[model samples]
Every structure is written in C-alpha cells, then in structure tokens.
Target: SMLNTFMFPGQGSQAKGMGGALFDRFADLTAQADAVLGYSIRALCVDDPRDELGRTQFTQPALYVVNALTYYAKCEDSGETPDFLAGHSLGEFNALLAAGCFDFETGLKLVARRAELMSQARDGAMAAIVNASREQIERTLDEHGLVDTAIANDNTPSQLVISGPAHEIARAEALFQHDRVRYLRLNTSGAFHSKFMRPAQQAFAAHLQSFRLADPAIPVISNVSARPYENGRVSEGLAQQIASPVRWCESIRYLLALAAERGEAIEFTELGHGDVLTRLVHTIRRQTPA
Candidate 1:
C-alpha cells in the first residue's frame, strides 16, 4: 500500500491567484483569517488590490490559511489522516496545524508575529544555487572567504540556498560562475533561516513561550533537525527553526526510509498552490539511491 505524506510549501509558492476555490470551500476559516489579519483573505489571494500578497506580513498568513484549508478539504473527502507531515519554512505552521498542534487562529497569530519580526529584519538577502552539490558549494564558500554566507535551504541534492548580508549575497554571484551552476537571487527582504535571524529567533522564542504547545498528534518533521519533533519541544522547535537551515532533503529521505522500513510505498502530496515541493520530491527520489 502507498502511505501518504503531505508536504506544504512556503513563501515563494504564493502567487496572485492561489487559493481560488479553497477559500470559499472553507468559508468559516476564511472569515477567521480575515478577522485576525484585518484584511480579506479571499481578496488577498484571489485578487491583489494593493499587491500585498508578496509582502512577508501577508504572504505568511495567506499561505497558512490556504494550505490549512487545502488539508481540511482533502481530509473531509478522503476521511484519512496522513502518515507523515513536513513543511518548508512558513509551511511548517500549516503542517503543525494539520497535526493538531494548535487551532487556526493560534497558528495564524504566531505566524503574523513571526512575519512582522522577519519583515522588520530587512538587512539581509537570499539566493538559490542550482545544480551544485553541497560539498562543492561549501568548498566555494570557504575558498572565497564567504564565511558568513550560510546554507539556508538544503532543498534537494543539487538545489541549495545561501543566506547572508546583502553585500555577501551580492558577491556570491561571481563565485559560482560555472556553466552548470546557476545562481538566482530570491525576492526576500530578510535573510531567513540564517544567523542573521538570531534576533528574530530570540524574539519569536519569547513570543512562543507564552503559549502552551501540545505534542503533534501526527509526526511532523523538524526543518532544523530533519527528525520527528519530540514531545514538549514544539515551541522550541518552532522558535529554533527561525534561524536554522531547512533540512528538507534529509526530511524527505527520512520519510522514504521510514516507508521502506514499514514495507509500504510512499506518495507525497503537495497541499499548497504550486507544485514546487512536488517537483523537488521528484528530483530527490530520482537522485536518491534505490
């Protein structure tokens, strides 16, 4: 049997016309998001009146709400719970919500505060380096004295993102000039998942401690550790994730190994708007040894 693993995407996955059908499908949740956010969630995702969806403040909440609704829609029809849950950055909140860590409003408030803090830390940048192995990327960074540049997202075997101050990220372009290695600067205001976020991490950690987090009902992998979240550490996990690399590759590999160990085929379903995680899963499966 093919056991199901649900993955949710973050940030870049949001676009102008994402949650078209799902917003109405879960009307109550949509209203709640609107109430919390002070903006119409439906209008933000469906139509861009002020073009705010791309901003971190709106993007995080919008993605969380839409992703949550997508999961609810799937569960309502299938009446089945996923075998595993994993999410990238902002999407991790969605995964936690799916796992019953918190209700929608609670998760949205945390996400809103996180977004506000991250957006405030505006003196950083991020870039995606394609077709470069981890070793190669590490060697180049070390050789070039770009010590501050940290590998933010270990997305796939060949795809990685480096984060650092704006100048360092700008200088990275000349280093990875190989024909096969492609570097693309991402449209982000802050150096997320890097040391630069330490301040945000501390603030968010303080914000997190006030809440009483429950252990995930379903196993949700941690982006910082690439392992299932341990009990009594959900708040710490979320707080730590703010300034840590997303171990997406290891997380997926862990799920694949878990499936094989249990004698079941694994299928990944990307619940958000885009097929970004789905495509990454394909690349990971192809590159991972049989």
Candidate 2:
C-alpha cells in the first residue's frame, strides 16, 4: 500500500483571497471559528477589509482556520486518514488538529494566543537565504560576528531562513552576498524561531498550560525536533517551537526514510493556500531521498 502524508503551509503561504471556496463549503466550521476569534474569518480571508491578513496576530488564526477547513473538506470528500501529518510553523497546530490532538475551536484559541504573543515580540526580522546550506550559513554568521542572528528555518537542502534583530538581519544580507546565493527579506512581524522569541515562548508556554493536550492519533512530526512527537510532550513541543529552528528539511527526510523502510511509495499533499511546502518537498526529493 502507498503511504500518504498531508502537509500544511504556514504564514508565508497566505494570500488575500484564500479559503474563498472552503469557507462557504464548511459553513458550520466557519461559524464556530468566527465565534472563537470574535471576527469574521470569511471577511478576513475573502476580502481583507482591514488588511490584517498579513499581520501575525491575524494571520496565524486565519491560516489555521482556513487550513483546518480545507482538511475537513478533503475528509468529507475522500474520507481517509493520512499515514503521517506535518505542518510548517503555525501549520503544525493544524497537523495536531488533524491527528485528533485537539478540536478545531481549541486549536484556534491556541493559535490566537500564539499569534498575539508573537506579534508583541516584534522589533525583529527574518530573511530567506537561498542556495546556501545550513553549514555555510552558520559558518558565515560566526565569521562575521553576527551573533544575534540564528538559522530559523532549514527549508530545504539549499534554502535557509535567518532570524534576528532587524538591523542584524539587514547585516546578514551582505554576509550572504555571493554570485550563487540570493538573500530575500521576508515579511514577518518578528524574528520567529530564534532567541529573540524567548519572551513569546515563555508566555506561550504558560498559556498552553491552561489548555489540555492529547497525544496525536496519527503520527505527527514536530518542527522543533524533526521527529515524531512523543506522547506527553505536545505542550513542550508547541511551546519550544516558538524559539527553535524549524527543522523542516529534516522532518521531511524522516518521513521519506519511513517510506523507504516500509518499502512504500510515498505521496504528499499540501493542504492550504499556495504550494510553498509542495515546492520545497519537490526540491528536497530531487536532491536526495532519505
């Protein structure tokens, strides 16, 4: 039998009119999300009246609701559980939701708090360094005394995202300048997945304690560890993820390795917004299979 893995995209994948089709398709879920978030998710995603769609405080919950709706739509039509579930950054909560760790309303509440704390932890920046390996990025940072910057996302074999103070992130562009390398600053409210997010992480951890978490029914990979989440560690995983590098490439590698060990051909479907994670997976599979 073939192995199926459902992937979810995070913040960067959002757009102005995402979930246009899914929201009305799943009206009850939309209503529940609207009540939980105290606003119209449909208006936010389908129209963006206040242009809060890109803001982290609004983006996280919006994306989570949309992603969850898309997943629900798929389940309604296809009626199958994936063998594995994974999400990028904020998307990880959706993975947990799909795995039966939490109900939709609970997931939205957690994401809303996470987004709020993360937004409050601003005065920082993040940028994507393309065509560079993690080792190369790390070595360059050490050589240049760019101590504040940390590798935030191991997106692929050739793509890494660095996060730190805005000025430090600006300084890194010149450090990564090369004939083959490209540095593109990302549109983010804060230096996510770095030491700069410690405040948010601490607050989020405390907030997480207020809620109950359940073990994932389907194996779900943790962005913090690049391994399947251990039972009883869901809260820790979610909390630590705020200030940790997203080991995305490694997480996919682990899944690919699982497919190899089981001698099963694997398939991955990206479930939200654009094909950001899908493109990353393509780049990964072409280079090497782990």
Candidate 3:
C-alpha cells in the first residue's frame, strides 16, 4: 500500500475555544494535558480571557494538544493511522508526538518552551503579501535597501509572507505603497525564521540538549531543508529550524519525489483546524494520488 501521511497546521490556526469539541469528546486526553501543563488547558481553550489564547505561549501548546487529540479521535473513529507525519513550523512538535518520538507531555513541554523563548525574543515583525510574484517582492525589498529584513514564504503562486525587524518591515511596507501588492501584518510575536531569531535559536539549542529524543517510528520531514532528517540528525534539524526559513514548497516537492521513487503516491490530509494549508496544497498541485 502507498504511504498515508498526516500534515498538521501551525501557530496561525489558533483561536479561542479551538479544541472545545475535542475536549468534550476526549476527556482523558484533556485531563492528561491539564495535569502535565499544571493549568486548566481545557478551560483555557474554551474560556480564554482577553483572547490571550492567540498569544504565542498559549497558541503553540493549545494547538499541539488539540491537533494530537483530534488526530487520536479521528483514528479511533475510523480505525486508521497514517504511515508518515509532518507539520508546519510549530506543528512539527505535534507530528513528532504522533510518530511516537515523544509522549504528549514532553511534546507539550517543548511547545511551551519554544513559544516562551520566541515571545521573549520579540524584536521584529511579519507581514503577509498577496498576489505578488517573488521576483517583484525581492526587487522591492532590494530597492528599499531592506534585504536583511526580508525572508520569503512561498505559500502559493499568489501568496507570500515576509518577516524581519520592525523598522525594516516598515521600510518595506512603505515601499509597497501604491503598488499592486497588498500587505497585512501578522499576529506572530516575532519575525520567526529570520536573522532576528538567532538569539532564540542559540538559547533553544542549549535547552534542547538536556532532553533525550528517541528516533521516530516513521519518517518526519524537516521544515528547514524540506527533507527527512537522516539518522542521528534530528536534534541538528530542530536547532537549525529555529532561525531558518521554512522551505515548505521544497518540502512538499521533496515528499512527492520520494513517493515517486518508492512507487507510492502521496495524499496530504491536513489535520487540526485551518484550511490554509489545504488551500496552499491545492494551489501548489491540482491533484495527487490517494
């Protein structure tokens, strides 16, 4: 049989009460998460104050738990499990847990640590640019002398995200004025996957060394290089991911390539809440074998 894969969404999908339905359906998982997290996670998800659920610290952990539990429920409902798992940025932690590399408690702790560290290193901002070609965006960035502040996310042909320092982003934003490109600010705590995140990456590498990571039962793709981590390189991949751009388009292309080599087809099913990645996949390729 061809491989079955699960893809998990990351930070932007989070919202207040995101996993209420799953919490209601899976009491045991909710209780376990609450006990390990030392807070009423279920309550936090269903009853957030000031809408802080969308904050980085809250958003990462909430999304991880929700995705894990929902995937569990879905498997139980259908008696099915994917042979491979991958995720976008923060969602990678959830994918690792699903692959049996870490328990839910450890995964939640990692997500919490990542979110906290990133929030503390908030020195920049991010913005989404729609209907702009990469060449046009890059030229605009270069023209403004803001090359250092700009990093691109090729979500689709018409959509891209640029992240960097606040002032540089402001310069870039201003340059786009009266241009056909539409720019909108992202709610992310910092300019993730940019040079400004280097401090956080260094600190996170030190923190990650203390934890013991087991090899995953199934291959888990790295967002940094869009390839599967070779044996004994998981930690390195995690460390590099902190300050590296997410090569999502490359990763998908690599996955498709591997599937072809194995004489298997790839079917991408996005787990958790958002339809954002689903839309991206549709725009990237019209069809894939199921």
Model 2's alpha-carbon lDDT is 0.91
**Could you tell which candidate, 1 or 3, scores higher by TM-score?**
1
Candidate 2 has a TM-score of 0.97
TM-score of each: 0.97, 0.97, 0.91
Better of 1 and 3 by lDDT: 1
Which residues of candidate 1, in runs, are more than 4 Å off?
Answer: none
For residues 201-221, write the lDDT of model 1, one tens digit per residue: 999999998788889999999
**Lowest summed-lDDT stretch of 10 residues in model 2?**
281-290
The deviation in Å at residue 82 for candidate 1 is 0.3
lDDT of 2 by residue, 1-290 (tens): 37999999998888989999888888988999899989999999999998998889999998898889889888889887799999999999999999999899999999999999899976799999998888889999899888898899999999989998898898988987897999999988699999988989999999999888999999999999999999999999999998999999999999998899888899898888889999999998998834
Which portions of model 3 miss their true places by more than 4 Å?
177-180, 287-290
Question: In each prediction, how many residue pairs overlap at the backbone (N, C-alpha, C within less than 3 A)?
Answer: 0, 0, 0
Task: Tell me the lDDT of candidate 1.
Answer: 0.91
Reference-based lDDT, residue 110, model 1: 97
Q: Candidate 3 overall Cα lDDT vs. reference?
A: 0.78
Query: How much does candidate 3 score in TM-score?
Result: 0.91
